[PDB]
Amino acid sequence: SMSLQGKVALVTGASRGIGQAIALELGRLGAVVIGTATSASGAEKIAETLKANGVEGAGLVLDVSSDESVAATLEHIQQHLGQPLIVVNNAGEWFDVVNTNLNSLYRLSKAVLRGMTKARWGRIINIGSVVGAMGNAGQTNYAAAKAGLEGFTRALAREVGSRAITVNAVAPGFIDTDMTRELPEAQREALLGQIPLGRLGQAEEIAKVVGFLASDGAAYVTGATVPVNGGMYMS
Amino acid sequence: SMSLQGKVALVTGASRGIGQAIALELGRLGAVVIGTATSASGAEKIAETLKANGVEGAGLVLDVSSDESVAATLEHIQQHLGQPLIVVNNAGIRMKDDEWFDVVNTNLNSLYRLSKAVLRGMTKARWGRIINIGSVVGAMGNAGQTNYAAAKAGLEGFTRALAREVGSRAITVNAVAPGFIDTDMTRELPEAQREALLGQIPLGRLGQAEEIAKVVGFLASDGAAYVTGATVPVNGGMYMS
Amino acid sequence: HHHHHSSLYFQSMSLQGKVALVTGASRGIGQAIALELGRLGAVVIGTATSASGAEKIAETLKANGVEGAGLVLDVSSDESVAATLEHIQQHLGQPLIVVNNAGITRDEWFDVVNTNLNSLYRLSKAVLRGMTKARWGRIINIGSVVGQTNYAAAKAGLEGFTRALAREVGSRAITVNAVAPGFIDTDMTRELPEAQREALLGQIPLGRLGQAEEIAKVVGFLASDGAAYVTGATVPVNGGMYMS
Amino acid sequence: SMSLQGKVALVTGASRGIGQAIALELGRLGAVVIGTATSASGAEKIAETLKANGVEGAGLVLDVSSDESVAATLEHIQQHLGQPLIVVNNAGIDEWFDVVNTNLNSLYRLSKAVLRGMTKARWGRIINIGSVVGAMGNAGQTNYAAAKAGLEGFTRALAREVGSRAITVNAVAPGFIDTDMTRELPEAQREALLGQIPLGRLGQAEEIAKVVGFLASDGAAYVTGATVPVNGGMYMS
Numbered sequence: 001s002m003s004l005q006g007k008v009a010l011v012t013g014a015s016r017g018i019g020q021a022i023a024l025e026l027g028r029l030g031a032v033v034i035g036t037a038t039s040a041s042g043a044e045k046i047a048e049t050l051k052a053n054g055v056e057g058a059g060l061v062l063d064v065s066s067d068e069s070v071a072a073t074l075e076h077i078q079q080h081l082g083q084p085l086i087v088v089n090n091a092g093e094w095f096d097v098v099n100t101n102l103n104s105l106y107r108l109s110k111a112v113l114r115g116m117t118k119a120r121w122g123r124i125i126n127i128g129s130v131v132g133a134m135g136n137a138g139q140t141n142y143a144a145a146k147a148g149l150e151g152f153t154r155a156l157a158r159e160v161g162s163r164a165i166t167v168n169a170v171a172p173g174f175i176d177t178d179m180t181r182e183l184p185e186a187q188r189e190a191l192l193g194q195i196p197l198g199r200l201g202q203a204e205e206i207a208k209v210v211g212f213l214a215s216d217g218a219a220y221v222t223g224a225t226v227p228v229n230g231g232m233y234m235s
Numbered sequence: 236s237m238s239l240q241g242k243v244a245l246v247t248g249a250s251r252g253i254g255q256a257i258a259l260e261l262g263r264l265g266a267v268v269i270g271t272a273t274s275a276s277g278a279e280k281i282a283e284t285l286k287a288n289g290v291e292g293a294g295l296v297l298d299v300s301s302d303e304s305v306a307a308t309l310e311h312i313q314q315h316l317g318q319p320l321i322v323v324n325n326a327g328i329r330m331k332d333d334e335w336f337d338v339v340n341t342n343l344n345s346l347y348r349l350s351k352a353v354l355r356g357m358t359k360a361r362w363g364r365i366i367n368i369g370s371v372v373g374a375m376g377n378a379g380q381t382n383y384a385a386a387k388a389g390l391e392g393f394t395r396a397l398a399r400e401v402g403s404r405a406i407t408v409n410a411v412a413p414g415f416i417d418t419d420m421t422r423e424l425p426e427a428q429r430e431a432l433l434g435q436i437p438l439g440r441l442g443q444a445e446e447i448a449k450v451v452g453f454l455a456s457d458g459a460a461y462v463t464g465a466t467v468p469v470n471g472g473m474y475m476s
Numbered sequence: 477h478h479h480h481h482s483s484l485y486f487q488s489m490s491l492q493g494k495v496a497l498v499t500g501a502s503r504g505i506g507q508a509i510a511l512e513l514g515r516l517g518a519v520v521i522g523t524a525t526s527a528s529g530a531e532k533i534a535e536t537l538k539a540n541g542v543e544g545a546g547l548v549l550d551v552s553s554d555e556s557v558a559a560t561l562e563h564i565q566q567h568l569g570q571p572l573i574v575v576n577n578a579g580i581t582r583d584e585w586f587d588v589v590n591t592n593l594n595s596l597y598r599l600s601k602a603v604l605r606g607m608t609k610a611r612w613g614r615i616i617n618i619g620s621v622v623g624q625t626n627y628a629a630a631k632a633g634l635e636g637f638t639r640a641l642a643r644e645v646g647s648r649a650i651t652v653n654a655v656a657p658g659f660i661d662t663d664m665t666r667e668l669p670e671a672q673r674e675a676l677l678g679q680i681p682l683g684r685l686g687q688a689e690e691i692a693k694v695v696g697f698l699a700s701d702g703a704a705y706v707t708g709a710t711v712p713v714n715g716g717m718y719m720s
Numbered sequence: 721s722m723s724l725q726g727k728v729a730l731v732t733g734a735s736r737g738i739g740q741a742i743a744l745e746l747g748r749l750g751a752v753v754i755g756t757a758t759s760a761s762g763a764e765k766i767a768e769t770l771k772a773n774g775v776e777g778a779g780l781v782l783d784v785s786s787d788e789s790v791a792a793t794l795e796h797i798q799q800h801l802g803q804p805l806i807v808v809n810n811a812g813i814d815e816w817f818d819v820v821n822t823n824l825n826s827l828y829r830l831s832k833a834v835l836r837g838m839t840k841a842r843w844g845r846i847i848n849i850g851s852v853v854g855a856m857g858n859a860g861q862t863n864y865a866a867a868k869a870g871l872e873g874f875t876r877a878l879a880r881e882v883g884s885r886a887i888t889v890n891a892v893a894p895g896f897i898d899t900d901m902t903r904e905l906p907e908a909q910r911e912a913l914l915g916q917i918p919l920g921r922l923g924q925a926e927e928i929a930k931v932v933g934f935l936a937s938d939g940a941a942y943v944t945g946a947t948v949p950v951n952g953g954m955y956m957s
């Protein structure tokens with residue numbers, strides 16, 4: 001009813017924080033999890049983490065900005081493990097950052113669509129950027145990235161829906177990660193001040209949401225961006 | 236996990252469709268489920284349905300537009316079953332484009348009336364889940380569009396505001412905005428009108444009451460503890476606003 | 477101590493001896509909107525909730541060469557609305573431009589938004605008969621100036637209401653729009669200290685507070701024949717500072 | 721002063737419809753109007769149209785997808801006519817993705833290039849014109865919603881970056897406008913369309929233009945980051 005048994009899940013940028021937590025959550029729901037990183041040591045770290053948590057799968061090196069890397073990586077997964085029917089995009093000034101992030105969502109999403117099309121089933125879930133950056137530049141970039149993600153996600157959902165593939169996004173707020181743990185105190189406090197719940201979110205709390213979107217029970221949810229921000233809305 | 240043992244859940248308008256499906260889903264997750272209706276026969280029906288599905292709880296008559304009814308109904312639940320920490324608001328009242336105001340004005344007043352009443356219990360427990368269910372697309376033309384967009388936008392704003400006011404107490408407030416769900420309206424449409432309808436839905440199909448329910452089920456859980464102020468669309472990719 | 481007060485040459489301004497009702501016109505934004513519509517040549521009835529406010533409105537219009545009147549109107553009251561419109565109809569003519577700027581203030585967010593929307597509806601509904609007969613109309617709703625919770629709520633209530641109404645009365649060539657102000661320079665903001673001012677300005681791209689007059693120009697353009705295809709819209713006037 | 725005397729305005733894609741109407745409107749408000757097209761005959765047509773309407777300015781060939789063409793064209797305007805302080809982007813240079821990606825790249829390319837002049841003058845108006853509903857049905861809805869949402873986010877981001885220089889950046893999101901697309905509808909097909917528009921009519925190119933005309937002015941100096949819908953009450957998101 002809430003299981004992912006027999007499903008292969010690709011999770012990009014799974015070596016740390018949110019990506020790692022998503023990889024462990026999909027594993028717990030019984031998915032076979034391929035987590036990726038951009039380096040060999042990261043791929044092996046991913047592999048050791050899955051092992052030590054009893055999750056089947058693999059760590060591999062993937063560069064999401066490269067067609068060659070995407071194409072070859074998929075070929076690898078297809079030959080060895082199977083066709084990924086769950087894909088979580090978590091692998092990443094303002095214009096180039098959003099332009100490049102969306103180009104890579106598209107590049108990767110397009111590549112996995114052939115497999116989901118053949119299976120008449122799929123879950124693509126895009127993870128947004130965490131709140132955290134410094135001053136007004138952080139605010140501008142964050143709002144832009146989020147709005148880019150919300151529009152892209154809806155458009156894609158609309159294009160691939162007749163095949164029973166859902167496309168959704170998770171827009172995190174102020175989350176406790178390695179990046180946020182070492183923020184200056186005042187930038188941390190200011191941010192807590194804007195959060196109704198009065199606390200930072202855990203990586204795990206993003207992961208549960210992804211977990212539910214991956215499931216059969218979220219089969220009528222598509223085109224949606226689920227904010228996970230403790231009531232803090234920054235636009 | 237996702238588990239609701241030891242939790243009492245109030246589900247308003249639980250006699251049919253979405254409300255019924257939510258009541259059964261919360262029950263399945265182990266909640267003690269009080270479903271309500273506006274009539275005695277509806278309360279009876281709710282009770283028979285819960286019984287026949289092995290869900291503990293009750294069917295009660297509740298009129299959400301009445302302070303007396305709200306106050307008395309809560310007292311009854313408190314004395315007999317316990318303090319509801321999960322509350323799902325699904326009780327709302329030739330469709331034209333001038334009906335929107337009455338409908339939205341009335342529905343929001345009653346969300347507020349009911350939400351305010353259960354907050355005392357959730358405040359004391361330092362935990363809570365309020366989940367507001369939006370209206371299904373009620374009709375097909377322009378009047379249908381206007382009313383639906385208005386109800387949804389009223390629900391989105393209300394939900395966010397309330398989430399902001401009660402968040403420091405670890406109470407989350409969220410909404411589910413359904414799309415085209417299989418309703419008697421959607422069943423007794425003309426045939427040519429039905430395919431045209433499906434054509435405007437990327438998924439190419441009507442949604443099941445159960446699919447709304449799973450979403451509510453997840454919002455009720457501990458894993459949705461950092462989700463608040465959100466409106467989760469459940470519409471198969473069909474966005475009317 | 478009257479509850480109504482007053483204020484060949486042929487003008488050639490965008491508003492054609494069109495009659496405009498501007499609620500809450502005694503100060504700031506409302507006053508500025510009343511003067512702007514007047515400058516565009518409208519006959520301006522500004523309202524307040526007290527006799528002295530209506531007097532002040534009338535003196536202000538006079539001293540700026542705007543024809544019209546200051547009237548006492550309570551927008552939360554059907555009696556007051558109904559009677560006030562009758563009075564404008566009998567004496568001055570049918571208001572085809574209406575700017576809603578009368579909102580009260582202080583579990584409070586709900587009552588403020590609930591009450592303000594009920595009054596927008598009450599007043600809008602009442603003027604619609606006149607605009608229907610004339611096959612033309614402009615309703616413009618002014619949002620609240622900036623706290624965060626209340627502002628985001630008021631704004632979202634206004635955006636949805638405005639759009640729904642626009643949809644209901646569009647076939648009659650009546651447009652309905654809103655203006656969502658940001659941080660506007662007022663008496664409340666002028667007396668912010670040295671320290672609290674910079675922090676505020678820092679969150680505004682333009683690096684400055686908005687003037688009441690800048691809201692007014694926007695209303696002025698929405699009132700005109702050139703904004704005839706704009707309806708259901710909420711125009712943010714906030715210097716790039718977006719809070720939701 | 722809701723006028724534009726002594727101001728130079730660049731209007732891209734000014735040979736027909738919305739772009740043409742914007743060029744004439746800015747001219748009427750007293751601006752010196754450089755309208756552009758992607759072909760020589762279009763630049764010619766632009767020049768003859770401005771002349772016959774008493775508007776000062778020029779018709780130029782500009783390809784907005786090309787850095788060479790942008791750079792050279794600005795250089796030509798600067799040397800010969802002056803620095804454009806009002807710029808209206810109206811040029812259009814798994815369809816949805818490439819269209820929006822390419823449109824935004826070209827808004828950025830062009831916006832960046834004119835910013836030097838506006839930065840120096842400490843004043844500027846960039847106005848981005850969205851796409852008209854391009855077809856009916858599902859593909860039409862998807863592409864239109866995507867273009868619009870891309871335009872709304874971009875416009876807000878840019879407004880944020882250049883705001884301290886007193887440059888405003890806004891967008892106009894047209895609905896169903898009377899242009900070639902709607903002019904060639906069948907009979908049953910157009911009434912159905914009008915039925916979904918509260919105003920019960922198509923918009924005129926001129927009505928987009930008045931809105932741009934107001935955004936260009938001093939009275940819209942506190943409006944920035946905004947997308948003004950001009951759609952007769954017909955909202956497709």
Ligand SMILES: COc1ccccc1NC(=O)Nc1nn(C)c2cccc(OC)c12
Nearest residue numbers: 339340389392393396589590629633636637
């Ligand atoms: C007033 O209730 C609110 C509290 C906080 C945030 C939003 C709202 N309400 C709204 O956003 N909208 C509406 N509130 N009410 C009472 C309405 C009545 C008719 C139509 C409405 O919005 C389309 C609203």
Ligand SMILES: COc1ccccc1NC(=O)Nc1nn(C)c2cccc(OC)c12
Nearest residue numbers: 098144147148151152820866870873874877
């Ligand atoms: C470059 O895109 C942006 C820059 C600044 C702020 C927002 C955006 N992007 C968007 O809002 N949307 C989209 N941007 N891009 C490059 C897109 C590509 C395909 C679909 C898109 O959203 C509809 C966007």
Ligand code: NI
Nearest residue numbers: 796797799800
């Ligand atoms: Ni030369």
